[PDB]
Homo-oligomer: A and B are copies of this chain.
Amino acid sequence: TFNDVKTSLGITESYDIVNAIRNSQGDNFKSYVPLATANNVAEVGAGILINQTVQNDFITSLVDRIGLVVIRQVSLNNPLKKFKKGQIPLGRTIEEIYTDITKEKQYDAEEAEQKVFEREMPNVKTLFHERNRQGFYHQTIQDDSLKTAFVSWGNFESFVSSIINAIYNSAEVDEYEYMKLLVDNYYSKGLFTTVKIDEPTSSTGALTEFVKKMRATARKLTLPQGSRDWNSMAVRTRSYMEDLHLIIDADLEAELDVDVLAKAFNMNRTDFLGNVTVIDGFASTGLEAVLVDKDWFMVYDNLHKMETVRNPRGLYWNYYYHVWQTLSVSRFANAVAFVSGDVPAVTQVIVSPNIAAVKQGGQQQFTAYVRATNAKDHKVVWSVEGGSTGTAITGDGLLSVSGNEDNQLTVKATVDIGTEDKPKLVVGEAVVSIRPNNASGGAQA
C-alpha cells in the first residue's frame, strides 16, 4: 500500500551512466552509443525493489501483470560441525582436570631429615564449562493469508517449504557463528598465543613468510617434550599432529595456493601441516588464522526440539526450534593465533596456581608466566587486593597471609606496557581464601 516510490531507493550513483557520460562521451563508453534503448535499460535494469502497477503502453487501464515467479532457495551448512563432541543429557557443567609436571629438587641428604613426610601438593588446573546457549527460533506460517500472493499451487508449496528451511538454515548459521565467536572471544581476552606472521624481518623474497612460520609453529606444537607456552594455563601439553586443525581465512589460503603451491615441485614440503578448514575470515582485527587441537573445542549439545502449535483464531502455525548447547573452549589445549597487524607486547599474564586456601599466618609461593610478543622481558609487580596491613607479597611472588585476616584475597601480577598516559597494565589475577587460625591471641614481646 505505497506511493511516490522513486525506483532509485538504495541507489548511490557513483556516476550517472547516461547524463554524465554516455550522452557526452568521446571516450571508452563509445560502444553503447549504437544502442538506442540504453536509457530504458539504465532505468530499471538493476532490479526494482517495490512493485508498481504499470499500465499498458497501448491501452491504458490494462495492468501489466507479473508473468513469472521464480523462488530462490538456498541451503546453508555449518562447516564446523566436525568440532562438536556430542550430546550432554543430564548435567549442566563439565569438569576438566589437568595434572602437569613438577619441578625437580636437588638431591640433598642433609635437608632430608625433616622433610620425609613433607607434603608437596600436585600442580592441578581445573576448568569448568557451563551450558551457554539456550535459544529458540520462531517462525509463523499464516497458511491462509499467503494464498493472496500466489496464483499457483506449486509456488505455494515452493514457498512454504522455504520457510521450513529458513529455520534449518538459521540454526545452522548461528551454529557456525557461535563457534566463530569463541575464537574472537578468546583472542579479545588475550587468551590466544599470539604469533605474528606478516612481520618479515628478512629482506626481499618474503612471499613464503607466512608459510615458514605456520609450518614451524605447527611443528613446535608437536615436540614430544611438549611446551609451556601455547596454552593459556601455562601447562606442559603436547599435540600429536593428527589432531591439529587450522581454521584459516579464505584470503590466506590463496596466498598459500598461488605464491607457494604453484612453483612447488614437491607440494608435501610446503602444505600447511594438519587439517585445513577455510572460513571467510575472523571478526578480530589482524587475526588471519588459528591453529588448534581437536580438544580445544568443548562444544556440546543438550536439546534439539522442533515444536509447533496452531492458532485457530489467527489461522496460523508457530514453529519453535529450540537449540540448547554448551559452547566452550579448552584452556588446556594449544591454540595459536597467526596475526598480522600491530599487537600489544604482553597479551596474557598467568599467575600460577590460580586459587589457594592458605591458613592465617601461612604463606604461598606464586609464579607469573608472561605471554609476551617480542621479548622485552617485562618486569612483574606483585600485589594483594582486599587485605589488611598485615598481608603483603614480595619479590618473586611469595604471599604472606597475616594472622588477622579472613578475607578472600586477589593476587595480582602487574605488567606495564604503557607509558605516560593512562598506561597499559596487563594484570593477571589469582584468588586466595583464608582458613582461620586459633593463633593464641593478644600481643607479643
Binding site for B on A (CB under 8 A): 1-5, 9-17, 20, 24-38, 40-42, 44-47, 49-50, 96, 127-130, 132-135, 174, 177-178, 180-182, 184-186, 188-191, 201-205, 232, 283, 285, 298, 327-331, 344, 347-351, 354-355, 357, 367-370, 372, 376-380, 396, 408, 425-431, 433
Question: A7 → chain B, closest Cβ, in Å?
Answer: 9
Give A204's nearest chain B residue, CB to CB: B205
Q: Are B368 and A50 in contact (CB under 8 A)?
A: no
Closest 4 CB pairs of A and B: A26-B377, A10-B429, A36-B135, A17-B188
State which of B49, B130, B132, B188 has its C-beta within 8 Å of the C-beta of A15.
B188
With A40-B133, A47-B96, A331-B47 as contacts: A13 and B349 at CB distance below 8 Å: no
State which of B14, B177, B329 has its C-beta within 8 Å of the C-beta of A347.
B14
Q: Are A12 and B96 in contact (CB under 8 A)?
A: no
Give A17's nearest chain B residue, CB to CB: B188
Chain B positions within 8 Å of A50 at CB level = 354-355
Question: A48 → chain B, closest Cβ, in Å?
Answer: 12
State which of B2, B25, B232, B349 has its C-beta within 8 Å of the C-beta of A431.
B2
Q: Are A370 and B41 in contact (CB under 8 A)?
A: no
With A11-B190, A425-B12 as contacts: A408 and B203 at CB distance below 8 Å: no
Q: Are A12 and B349 in contact (CB under 8 A)?
A: yes
Give A182's nearest chain B residue, CB to CB: B45
State which of B14, B188, B203, B348 has its C-beta within 8 Å of the C-beta of A203.
B203
With A27-B378, A135-B37 as contacts: A329 and B9 at CB distance below 8 Å: no
Candidate in A31, A135, A433 with the most chain B CB atoms within 10 angstroms: A31
Q: Are A25 and B349 in contact (CB under 8 A)?
A: no
Q: Are B12 and A427 in contact (CB under 8 A)?
A: yes
Q: Are B188 and A10 in contact (CB under 8 A)?
A: no
With A31-B283, A37-B133, A189-B11 as contacts: A46 and B331 at CB distance below 8 Å: yes
Chain B positions within 8 Å of A377 at CB level = 24, 26-28
Chain B positions within 8 Å of A185 at CB level = 17, 41-42, 45-46
Q: Are B368 and A5 in contact (CB under 8 A)?
A: no
Chain B positions within 8 Å of A96 at CB level = 47
Chain B positions within 8 Å of A369 at CB level = 30
Return 12 A-B CB contacts under 8 Å, by A number: A2-B433, A10-B348, A15-B188, A17-B184, A17-B185, A26-B380, A32-B181, A34-B174, A46-B182, A46-B232, A46-B331, A47-B329
With A12-B425, A181-B35, A283-B29 as contacts: A46 and B1 at CB distance below 8 Å: no
Q: Are B347 and A5 in contact (CB under 8 A)?
A: no
Give A136's nearest chain B residue, CB to CB: B36
Q: Are B181 and A14 in contact (CB under 8 A)?
A: no
Question: A293 → chain B, closest Cβ, in Å?
Answer: 14
Chain B positions within 8 Å of A182 at CB level = 41, 45-46
State which of B13, B29, B47, B351 has its C-beta within 8 Å of the C-beta of A330.
B47
Give A177's nearest chain B residue, CB to CB: B31
Question: A25 → chain B, closest Cβ, in Å?
Answer: 5
Candidate in A132, A327, A328 with the most chain B CB atoms within 10 angstroms: A132
Q: Are B372 and A26 in contact (CB under 8 A)?
A: yes
Chain B positions within 8 Å of A380 at CB level = 25-26
Q: Are A9 and B379 in contact (CB under 8 A)?
A: no
State which of B28, B30, B38 has its C-beta within 8 Å of the C-beta of A181.
B38
With A9-B429, A35-B181, A328-B45 as contacts: A188 and B16 at CB distance below 8 Å: yes
